Amino acid sequence: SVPSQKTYQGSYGFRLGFLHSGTAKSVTCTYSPALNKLFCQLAKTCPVQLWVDSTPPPGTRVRAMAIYKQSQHMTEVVRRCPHHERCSDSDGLAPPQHLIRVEGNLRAEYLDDRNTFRHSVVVPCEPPEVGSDCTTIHYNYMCYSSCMGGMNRRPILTIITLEDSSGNLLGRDSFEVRVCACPGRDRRTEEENLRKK
Numbered sequence: 001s002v003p004s005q006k007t008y009q010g011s012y013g014f015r016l017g018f019l020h021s022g023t024a025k026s027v028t029c030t031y032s033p034a035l036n037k038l039f040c041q042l043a044k045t046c047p048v049q050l051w052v053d054s055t056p057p058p059g060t061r062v063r064a065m066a067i068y069k070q071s072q073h074m075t076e077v078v079r080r081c082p083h084h085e086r087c088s089d090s091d092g093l094a095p096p097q098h099l100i101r102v103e104g105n106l107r108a109e110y111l112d113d114r115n116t117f118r119h120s121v122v123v124p125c126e127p128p129e130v131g132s133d134c135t136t137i138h139y140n141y142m143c144y145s146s147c148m149g150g151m152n153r154r155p156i157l158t159i160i161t162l163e164d165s166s167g168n169l170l171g172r173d174s175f176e177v178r179v180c181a182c183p184g185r186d187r188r189t190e191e192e193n194l195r196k197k
Ligand SMILES: CCN(CC)C1CCN(Cc2cc(C#CCO)cc(I)c2O)CC1
Pocket: 050, 051, 052, 053, 054, 055, 056, 057, 058, 059, 060, 125, 126, 127, 128, 133, 134, 135
């Protein structure tokens, strides 16, 4: 079973947004619009914006899940490697096996799907802070793309779904992720490769 990755704005005009963080060697998280790909360091804060055209109902939630991008792997559950799942870096809420965490939200819930065994983290959808136009969720990715016995150099996608209180689909967006030591350099490289290709 592979979760859908079809972009779907839905009734509320749901879509993601990303900051413009640049590609300096020191940058810890940076998004490439050309590649639709986020590059980030291990366990560092990744701001992801939520934008809507109209207010979803109270009880709406926002779920994040990782899948493998490549066809021959998409069927395999994305999880932390055998080292990182045992390094006791728990925040008290996230299971140690989960790749994706939400940082600094006490209402975050972590799901191990009883049928697909896939992991996800879900939070309530909330309106922007006074003065802002969108809401920001802070994600952490808790393994490197290169982790042996884990992602093992396989590219992943994060799928973000807007859900009603029952879990029914209201909206969907997605982006590729590379968790790496030097996001700035890697983004610059992959953008250059694309331009040549
Ligand atoms: C520019 C003026 N229009 C856009 C055309 C509105 C701006 C105000 N927002 C309110 C709003 C509510 C929720 C929520 C919730 C749970 O009930 C989540 C988000 I992100 C959010 O932006 C709605 C859109």
